[PDB]
């Protein structure tokens, strides 16, 4: 009931905190995944 | 009307002023005839006439030809009647031809009636000859051209000006004490003085060099404007 | 009076004017 | 822990050579080829475990950049961007998207005069953003800039020294190149205002282990009998051995001498060769002894690399003061590599005599639309209205052009003249040279067009004239009878 | 001896120059007599002769008196023979008295043969009168006075100067373009032109107002020095 | 907009002295008394409107820190803290609590060996935080650390060049303090690795401390044109040039003469220079339009000038002659009295016609003066008139123009003495002193231009009967004149 | 059961941005707390030495 | 009188004077 709801706070409030603390990591990973190069197009790593 | 110009002394500027006044009166939309009776024949050369041109009314009558064929058309409203050149034999013996030129008065009279020209300007010398007297008498009005110097001051008090002529001051200079004194004396000693005077303007000296009237050669010069004022005065006062 | 004084001065200065003046 | 990277210069001390990761370094180059060779030699310069990201514009990076088969890193990243400001702005995000940009090397090689269009404030903002991005990412960026007129940009870079971590410039000087390190900071200390000379051997840079700025090189005819004016004064007979000695010169002053018309082209070529072989450190001055120069010739010399051409009207020590004026100054103006395009602008019309309305309009419009001409100084368009009593054909007869760029056309009771490269002030002199009679007794009114827009408007207004109105080639008293 | 000054055109300054030349020569120690041939009688007024003095050689000859009594002595070395003021009627008809002045030529011949006068200046008119032709005929030298302007230049190509005359420039300005052009053309074309010219000076315009020759009026005047140089030149060449 | 502050060092260039607001600078010293003095000098070196806050440890700053009563800001605010690391960590927050950090200078005074217990990593983090804080708040922080063995810490500071806008060291060396600036940054550039010495005098740290080719000329010597070379020094008028000349010893001096009135002062000055600064000097005169005759040129030459350039010669030739006089000592003698030379320029002082005895005596005296050049004193000319005119008339025909021209009449011979004239230009003088017809007036002339010839001619001229001695016509010949009638016969 | 899951989801959803804004505005909260009273310890102002 | 109009066009100043004023040139031919 109320106790379990409060317990959910002791999980999601710290989640929101650590998730925000890794904001740069999340942004970097998302940019890696989606991969939108608008103007700088890698021609290819040469040997 | 017939306006006769004669100077109290040779070389005061009668011929130059005659040419300038004829040019100005013509520019005011009027037919003008200017006749040179002074034998020196220097009025022609102000109107871009070739020096070698010896034709003239005096010469036309001296050769028995018609004087009327010697006319010239300068502009649509200005005419010339050159005197003509005289030989050195003719120049050194003036009595042999002075009395043979009397016929010109009747021709001038019949022209004055022809109604063609609204002004008949005559350039006359001061030789006190029969021709000069007859032509001065023919003129309806007279203009006496003087300069502000001792010589003309004496001549005004010892020689007879034309009957009713107006004294016109020419060649007024700058920074001459004697000139100012004589002008002051004339301002109350003389009653026939015209209100307008022509200054010592280099344009007048150059105009004969350029064989043009001062009005045409340089209309922005003071002399051209003064001659314009004189032309207006002739219109307003010498109409009849 | 300026014009008359100047005229008298000139007449005294230049005798030719004074001769014809009177 | 983070490795340091080295610039690709042989015989260079580590103080000005090491670049620890986490900063921004800027390099300017005089020529594109020297920049690219420096890029390739930096490419071979990194260690096996070093990671390099290379940015290219207006070409394929896989075709122009190579790698040495013996030395260098195992693998580097070749990136291609459009020659636009937005690519440089997005660089950080675009590199993050495909690369985790931590402890990585970034080489920035741009096209020729690519940084000229970037505004100053936005350039400062981009530098600051790059600095923060690099410091946070612990990565290093190298900027290799071929440029000619970056003096204001160089002043900006000096004003932004906090954002940067090292500034150097490379100057072509005929046989060697000068490395001028304004400041360089690394893990081994800080150096400020170092000048060094380096040389290229088969596409490889070597340091050679300012000096002739004071020396003055001049022709004998420049000083009209005056001896050498100081210890730094040397005189040469003609502007040929002077050219050879200036080939050896680096930062001296060369004062050419002009006597006749024929000298202009060889002098133009020699100045072009010097300004291409040797950079802006040279001070090139052209002394005109005799009045045998055109304004277009002076513009040609200015474009070839001459600081200024001293007029013959000025006396000698005024020319010496002109020399003293360019002291401490660098020739920042751009000189095209091609020289023939410079001489093609001397006379682009090459048509003389009478021209038809359509032909004249076409010729003037073609000359006006030529991009390789000075603005508002291509020529002067004059319209003449003849005085009453004379026609346009008579005026056309009394009109004789003297130069190559003159064209004439009569139409609509109006005579049109076009003078090539003539100036507005010096128009009456040209008219007097052309017309035999003084101007004023032949025409009543004159309209003059000398600006590009005004001349174009006059041309397009003249074209709206129907045919049959075009053209092709003191009072005299008369006798009369008085009645 | 008999140095006749005649103006090419009236108003050039023949009378004032003649008075100045008389005064300059009398300063030089020569016996000088000036005889006014001008009917307008302006030469007398330049030597402090009152305007009322009607006597003159021409009037005396017309009235039958002896012209020898019509003279005035100005200084110990300068004598004057005025023309005499004529009546208005006489001026109106000059042809009634031009032919009655023949004896003046004989009188001047007698004065020349006398030797009392080492110089006899004559101020002449330009009217083509018989008397003036005779007076020029008896003149040993003639000076034609011109002014640098279009009028005199035109005259010099169409009117006949006396034979042997020398042209003298008077009323020379400063900075007149047409005048300078005419002066240079005259220098390079006129053979008889004299080396001396007389500049315009207020002294010459003021000399007649003071009824004195320009030399006596102000000896420091530039025109006075020019006239003195002309007098010396006449002494050197016209003697 | 933000003011730029300065370090308290005397005789220091602004490159190593200016400290713009918004940066961190570190100073290391050898002595704590030297640290206190430097801190106090920094305090008193700031402007009136400058805002300064002081942070010190292990002492009361109110008693140990002083301010000068004549220079420095109106007031400063101090901060006292225990010798602890936590104060250094919290410095930013503690200053923000009491002071708005915008446009403020903070001095961090530390105790002896105070920075010994701070670890390297925490020192780097503290420096980074301070740098970011200063950039955010546009404030400058000064830390003065008294220490002896901070070599490792100094190396760490060198490695922290990103967060440090300047690192300097000051070490005691017996009599002077040595200032070694590893790197410095300000608004006027960046300097690196400089070693300087400063000394402590009465509480002020002060930084420690032939003309054969220099060319001295008037600016008018180069019309419009600025100097040819570096040694070419221009002067506005020929008095500042003279005044500078009192310091030269062998320099090349070129004066400018544009008017004749400036001859006497120029000659006198040249005399003074030749009499004052030795014979190693070279004096020159350069005309501009026309300012000298022959006699005045000789006056200038005797006054001390080695060479005079005529106005005809172009400037290039002027510089050429300048370079030609290079090896030329002035070996002539210059008298002490300039009055002798000034008198030599004109010995006659009488003009116009004179009596025959007067003419003879004056000419003889001028020819008897020892202080005149030989055979250049003047020309004695005898003119015999063309028989057309006499001699008094010829005298009336000549108007001499100069002071030294005198004339007489005697024995039908008008004599002219043109003082200071050459034989070649005799005709020019005669044309100037006669009408245009060049000597056409007379028949023959007899010219004597040598001293023996002139003296013998004078002796011959003295042997004349006084009866043939003339007088001018204008004076002898001479109110209004009334004509008197007379009969002509 | 279903309502319990719904309420748990609702609580998680409401509390995730709660901590997101707690971290996002943490710096401003600390600054305001410093402003109010905080605890100005250690470094102490001595006085205005004029 | 005595007029020597030959060899006039050999002088520059006289040429300018003749060019400026038609009357002088008219006489000089
Ligand atoms: N007073 C005057 N006359 C001018 C001027 N421009 C042209 N002319 C006249 O036009 C003729 C032909 O000149 P162009 O067609 O430009 O053809 C010219 C041009 O190609 C060349 N040239 C002459 N002077 C110069 C110069 O100063 N610079 C250059 N670059 N070429 C010159 O020599 C050719 C023949 O010239 P010229 O024999 O002198 O003969 C010249 C000259 O009589 C000018 O500014 N002033
Ligand atoms: N179309 C045309 N335009 C003309 C002509 N003469 C002058 N101009 C124009 O007027 C300017 C003044 O030329 P300038 O006073 O003769 O001064 C001239 C002249 O003294 C001399 N010069 C150059 N080329 C020639 C040439 O071919 N012949 C002569 N005689 N002089 C030349 O160098 C100067 C060069 O003048 P710019 O700087 O080009 O500038 C010239 C040009 O724009 C001409 O004959 N034709
Ligand atoms: N007594 C006398 N002698 C005369 C006169 N005119 C010329 N000379 C003599 O002729 C020489 C040449 O002078 P210049 O050709 O007129 O050339 C002169 C002239 O251009 C100028 N100059 C000198 N003094 C004066 C002066 O007082 N006035 C002017 N306007 N120029 C002067 O300096 C030049 C050099 O003349 P000098 O060295 O004096 O040397 C003079 C002098 O010996 C003159 O009026 N009186
Ligand atoms: N061309 C020429 N003319 C000469 C010469 N000597 C004298 N004159 C003439 O004589 C006038 C009087 O000069 P000054 O009595 O020597 O008295 C002179 C003299 O003291 C001084 N001065 C003018 N020019 C010069 C010059 O070139 N050199 C010197 N040393 N003094 C000069 O100014 C005074 C007035 O001279 P100006 O107003 O020019 O007027 C000068 C000039 O017209 C000469 O050598 N050449
Ligand atoms: N106002 C003036 N200003 C300047 N020059 C003038 C003026 N009036 C006349 N002149 C000049 O005076 C000279 C003589 O004038 P002009 O010949 O017309 O007089 P004139 O009395 O007709 O002479 P003459 O009858 O003797 O031929 C000319 O050169 C003329 O240009
Ligand atoms: N060189 C001169 N400078 C200034 N004024 C002069 C000069 N020469 C003459 N004049 C003036 O010119 C006027 C004419 O002089 P003058 O009376 O002698 O003339 P003219 O030729 O004899 O003829 P007329 O007697 O009919 O005037 C006088 O007012 C005189 O003062
Ligand atoms: Mg007339
Ligand atoms: Mg008279």
Beta bridge partners of F378: F419
Length of chain D: 483
C-to-N gaps above 2.5 Å in chain B, after residues: none
Domain F4-207 and domain F215-342, same fold? Reply is yes
Residue nearest to atom 45 of ligand 1 (CA): D430
**Among F288, F287, F333, F290, which Cα is nearest to F307's?**
F287
Question: How far is CA F311 from each of CA D312, D313, F314, F321, rounded to the nearest angstrom?
Answer: 21, 19, 8, 14
Answer yes or no: is the C-beta of D232 below 6 A from any ligand 1 atom.
no
Answer yes or no: is the C-beta of D404 below 6 A from any ligand 1 atom.
yes
For residues A7 and D347, give the distance between their C-alpha atoms in angstroms, rounded to a whole number. Answer: 90
For residues F470 and F408, give the distance between their C-alpha atoms in angstroms, rounded to a whole number. Answer: 8
For residues F193 and D244, give the distance between their C-alpha atoms in angstroms, rounded to a whole number. Answer: 40
Ligand index nearest the alpha carbon of residue B217: 5
Please tell me which residue of chain F has the smallest CA distance to D216. F229
Length of chain E: 239
**Among F54, F114, F117, which Cα is nearest to G44's?**
F54
**Of ligand 2's atoms, which has the minimum distance to the CA of residue D433?**
45
For residues F277 and D159, give the distance between their C-alpha atoms in angstroms, rounded to a whole number. Answer: 52
For residue B70, give the DSSP letter: G
Residue F34 contacts residue F170 (beta carbons within 8 Å): yes
Give the containing element (helix H, strand E) for D217: strand D216-219
F343, two tokens: 């008198």
Whether residue A39 and residue D93 make contact (CB cut-off 8 A), yes or no, is no
Q: Which H, E and C letters describe F290-303, residue by residue?
A: CCCCHHHHHHHHHH
DSSP result, D65-127: ----SSSS-S-EEEEEE-SSHHHHHHHHHHHHHHS--SS-EEEEE--TT-GGGS-HHHHHHHH
Site residues for ligand 4, CB cut-off 6 Å = F 260, 290, 292-293, 296, 401-403, 432
Give the containing element (helix H, strand E) for E232: helix E222-237
Helix-then-strand count for chain B, H and E: 11, 8
Answer yes or no: is the C-beta of F77 below 6 A from any ligand 3 atom.
no
Of H26, H27, H28, which to mutate for an interface test with B (greatest number of B Cβ within 10 Å)? H26
Question: Which residue is listed with tokens 């009273």?
Answer: G37
Angle, helix F120-137 to helix F151-159, in steps of 10 degrees: 50
Query: In chain E, what are the domains?
Result: 2-238 (3.40.50.300)
Query: What residue spans define the domains of chain D?
Result: 4-207, 216-343, 357-462
For residues E140 and E144, give the distance between their C-alpha atoms in angstroms, rounded to a whole number. Answer: 14
DSSP result, F470-482: ---HHHHH-----
Answer yes or no: is the C-beta of E12 below 6 A from any ligand 6 atom.
yes
Q: How far is E27 from chain F (nearest CA, A)?
A: 7
Residue F269 contacts residue F295 (beta carbons within 8 Å): no
**Of ligand 4's atoms, which has the minimum distance to the CA of residue F296?**
30
For residue F311, give the DSSP letter: T
- Enumerate residues 6+ apart whose C-beta is below 8 A from F470: F391, F392, F395, F408, F409, F410
For residue D438, give the DSSP letter: P
Considering only the beta carbons, identify the residue of F60, F74, F94 that sits closest to G43.
F94
**Among F271, F217, F259, which Cα is nearest to F241's?**
F217
For residues D2 and D140, give the distance between their C-alpha atoms in angstroms, rounded to a whole number. Answer: 11
Q: What would you measure as the largest C-alpha separation in chain A, in angstroms?
A: 64
Pocket test for ligand 4, best of F264, F265, F432, F433 (most atoms within 8 A of CB): F432
Count contacts between D and F (CB, < 8 Å). Answer: 83
Residue F307 contacts residue F284 (beta carbons within 8 Å): yes
Q: How far is D43 from chain A (nearest CA, A)?
A: 12
**Among D131, D129, D120, which Cα is nearest to D154's?**
D120
Length of chain F: 489
**Of ligand 1's atoms, which has the minimum distance to the CA of residue D402?**
10
SS3 B114: helix
Residue nearest to atom 8 of ligand 1 (CA): D402
The CA R_g of chain G, rounded to the nearest whole Å, is 21
- Enumerate residues 6+ apart whose C-beta is below 8 A from D475: B48, B74, B75
**Among D105, D101, D43, D41, which Cα is nearest to D74's?**
D43
Burial D436-460 (b: 16+ CB within 10 A, else e): eeeeeebbeeeeebbeeeebbebbe
Considering only the beta carbons, identify the residue of A31, A36, A39 that sits closest to D81.
A39
- Enumerate residues 6+ apart whose C-beta is below 8 A from A20: G19, G20, G23, G24
CATH superfamily ID and name for F215-342: Response regulator (3.40.50.2300)
**Among D211, D124, D118, which Cα is nearest to D164's?**
D124
Residue B153 forms contact with C (CB below 8 Å) = yes
Residue D144 contacts residue D108 (beta carbons within 8 Å): yes
Whether residue B210 and residue H21 make contact (CB cut-off 8 A), yes or no, is yes
For residues B73 and B80, give the distance between their C-alpha atoms in angstroms, rounded to a whole number. Answer: 7
Please tell me which residue of chain D has the smallest CA distance to F22. D162
The stretches of F211-262 forming alpha helices (DSSP H) are: 240-245
Q: May I ask the CATH class of domain D357-462?
A: alpha beta
Answer yes or no: is the C-beta of E147 below 6 A from any ligand 6 atom.
no
SS3 E90: helix
Angle, helix D295-304 to helix D264-277, in steps of 10 degrees: 20
- Enumerate residues 6+ apart whose C-beta is below 8 A from D466: none
Q: What is the resolution of this structure in A?
A: 3.8
Neighbours of D194 (CB within 10 A): 16
Contacts 24+ apart (CB under 8 A), D404-407: D404/D347, D404/D349, D404/D350, D404/D351, D404/D352, D405/D347, D405/D349, D405/D350, D405/D351, D405/D379, D406/D352, D406/D434, D407/D349, D407/D351, D407/D352, D407/D353, D407/D355, D407/D360, D407/D363, D407/D364
CATH superfamily ID and name for D4-207: P-loop containing nucleotide triphosphate hydrolases (3.40.50.300)
Residue F231 contacts residue F214 (beta carbons within 8 Å): yes
For residues F171 and F149, give the distance between their C-alpha atoms in angstroms, rounded to a whole number. Answer: 11
Residue F291 contacts residue F263 (beta carbons within 8 Å): yes
For residues F189 and D183, give the distance between their C-alpha atoms in angstroms, rounded to a whole number. Answer: 9
For residues D147 and D34, give the distance between their C-alpha atoms in angstroms, rounded to a whole number. Answer: 11
Burial class from Cβ neighbours inside 10 Å (0-12, 13-18, 19+) for residue D104 reads buried
For residues F396 and F69, give the distance between their C-alpha atoms in angstroms, rounded to a whole number. Answer: 90
The stretches of D284-344 forming alpha helices (DSSP H) are: 295-304, 316-325, 340-343
For residues A28 and D26, give the distance between their C-alpha atoms in angstroms, rounded to a whole number. Answer: 27
Interface of D with F in 278-317 (CB under 8 A): 314-317
For residue F469, give the DSSP letter: B
**Of ligand 6's atoms, which has the minimum distance to the CA of residue E223?**
1
For residues F40 and F68, give the distance between their C-alpha atoms in angstroms, rounded to a whole number. Answer: 9
Query: φ, ψ for residue D158 (rounded to 5)?
Result: -65, -35
For residues F309 and D293, give the distance between their C-alpha atoms in angstroms, rounded to a whole number. Answer: 33
Interface of B with H in 102-131 (CB under 8 A): none
Residue G1 forms contact with A (CB below 8 Å) = no
The CA R_g of chain B, rounded to the nearest whole Å, is 17
Residue D147 contacts residue D28 (beta carbons within 8 Å): yes
Residue G49 forms contact with F (CB below 8 Å) = yes
How was this structure obtained? cryo-EM
Residue E174 forms contact with B (CB below 8 Å) = no
D424 CA to centre of ligand 1 in angstroms:
19
Residue F47 contacts residue F18 (beta carbons within 8 Å): no
Q: Which fold has domain D216-343?
A: Rossmann fold (3.40.50)
Whether residue B154 and residue C14 make contact (CB cut-off 8 A), yes or no, is no
E43 CA to centre of ligand 6 in angstroms:
11
Neighbours of B197 (CB within 10 A): 19
Angle, helix E14-27 to helix E222-237, in steps of 10 degrees: 70
């Amino acid at each position: 009931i109320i106790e379990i709801i409060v317990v959910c706070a002791l999980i999601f409030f710290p989640l929101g905190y650590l998730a925000r603390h890794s904001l740069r990591r999340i942004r970097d990973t998302l940019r890696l995944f989606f991969a939108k190069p608008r103007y700088v197009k890698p021609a290819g790593t040469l040997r | 009307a017939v306006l006769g110009l004669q100077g109290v002394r040779g070389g005061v500027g009668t011929t130059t002023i005659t040419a300038a006044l004829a040019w100005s009166l013509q520019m005011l939309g009027e037919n003008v005839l200017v006749v040179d009776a002074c034998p020196d024949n220097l009025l022609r050369l102000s109107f871009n006439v070739d020096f070698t041109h010896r034709q003239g009314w005096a010469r036309a009558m001296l050769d028995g030809q018609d004087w009327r064929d010697a006319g010239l058309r300068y502009t649509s409203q200005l005419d010339l009647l050159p005197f003509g050149q005289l030989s050195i034999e003719e120049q050194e013996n003036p009595q042999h031809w002075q009395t043979r030129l009397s016929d010109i008065c009747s021709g001038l009279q019949q022209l004055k009636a022809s109604g063609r020209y609204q002004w008949i300007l005559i350039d006359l010398p001061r030789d006190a000859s029969q021709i000069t007297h007859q032509l001065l008498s023919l003129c309806d009005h007279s203009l006496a051209i003087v300069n502000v110097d001792a010589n003309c001051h004496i001549r005004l008090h010892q020689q007879a000006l034309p009957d009713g002529a107006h004294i016109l001051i020419n060649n007024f200079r700058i920074g001459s004490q004697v000139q100012d004194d004589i002008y002051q004396l004339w301002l109350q000693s003389q009653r026939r003085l015209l209100p307008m005077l022509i200054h010592r303007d280099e344009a007048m000296a150059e105009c004969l060099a350029a064989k043009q009237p001062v009005g045409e050669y340089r209309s922005d010069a003071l002399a051209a404007e003064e001659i314009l004022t004189l032309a207006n005065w002739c219109l307003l006062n010498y109409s009849g | 009076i300026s014009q008359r004084e100047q005229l008298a001065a000139a007449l005294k200065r230049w005798p030719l004017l004074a001769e014809f003046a009177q | 822990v983070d490795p340091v990277f080295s610039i690709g210069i042989s015989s260079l001390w580590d103080e000005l050579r090491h670049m620890p990761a986490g900063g921004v370094w800027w390099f300017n180059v005089d020529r594109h080829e020297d920049a690219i060779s420096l890029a390739n030699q930096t490419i071979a310069s990194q260690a096996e475990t070093a990671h390099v990201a290379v940015i290219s514009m207006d070409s394929d990076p896989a075709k122009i950049f190579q790698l040495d088969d013996s030395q260098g890193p195992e693998k580097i990243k070749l990136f291609s961007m459009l020659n636009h400001e937005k690519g440089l702005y997005y660089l950080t995000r675009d590199l993050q998207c495909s690369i985790d940009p931590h402890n990585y090397l970034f080489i920035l090689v741009c096209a020729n005069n690519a940084w000229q269009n970037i505004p100053a404030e936005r350039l400062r903002s981009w530098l600051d953003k790059m600095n923060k991005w690099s410091r946070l990412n612990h990565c290093s960026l190298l900027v290799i800039n071929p440029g000619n007129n970056n003096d204001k940009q160089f002043s900006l870079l000096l004003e932004e020294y906090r954002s940067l971590f090292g500034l150097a410039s490379l100057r072509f000087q005929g046989d060697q190149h000068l490395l001028d390190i304004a400041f360089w900071c690394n893990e081994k200390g800080v150096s400020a205002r170092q000048q060094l000379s380096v040389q290229q051997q088969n596409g490889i840079w070597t340091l050679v282990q300012r000096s002739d700025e004071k020396r003055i090189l001049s022709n004998v005819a420049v000083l009209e009998g005056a001896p050498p004016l100081s210890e730094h004064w040397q005189l040469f007979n003609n502007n040929e051995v002077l050219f050879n000695e200036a080939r050896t010169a680096q930062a001296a002053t060369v004062v050419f001498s002009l006597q006749q018309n024929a000298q202009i082209e060889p002098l133009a070529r020699s100045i072009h060769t010097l300004r291409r072989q040797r950079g802006s450190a040279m001070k090139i001055l052209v002394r005109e002894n005799t009045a045998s120069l055109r304004a277009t010739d002076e513009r040609l010399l200015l474009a070839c690399g001459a600081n200024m051409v001293i007029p013959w009207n000025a006396p000698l020590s005024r020319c010496l003061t002109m020399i003293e004026s360019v002291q401490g100054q660098k020739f920042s103006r751009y000189v095209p590599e091609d020289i023939t395009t410079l001489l093609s602008m001397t006379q682009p019309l090459k048509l003389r005599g009478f021209q038809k309305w359509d032909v004249f309009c076409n010729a003037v419009n073609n000359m006006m639309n030529n991009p390789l001409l000075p603005a508002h100084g291509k020529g002067v368009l004059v319209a003449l209205r003849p005085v009453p009593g004379i026609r346009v054909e008579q005026a056309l007869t009394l009109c004789r052009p003297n130069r190559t760029g003159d064209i004439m056309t009569i139409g609509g009771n109006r005579l049109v003249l076009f003078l090539s490269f003539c100036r507005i002030n010096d128009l009456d002199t040209a008219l007097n040279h052309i017309f035999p009679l003084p101007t004023g007794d032949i025409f009543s009114n004159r309209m003059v067009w000398f600006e590009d827009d005004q001349i174009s408007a006059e041309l397009v207004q003249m074209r709206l004239l129907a045919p049959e109105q075009w053209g092709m080639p003191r009072r005299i008293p008369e006798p009369m009878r008085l009645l």
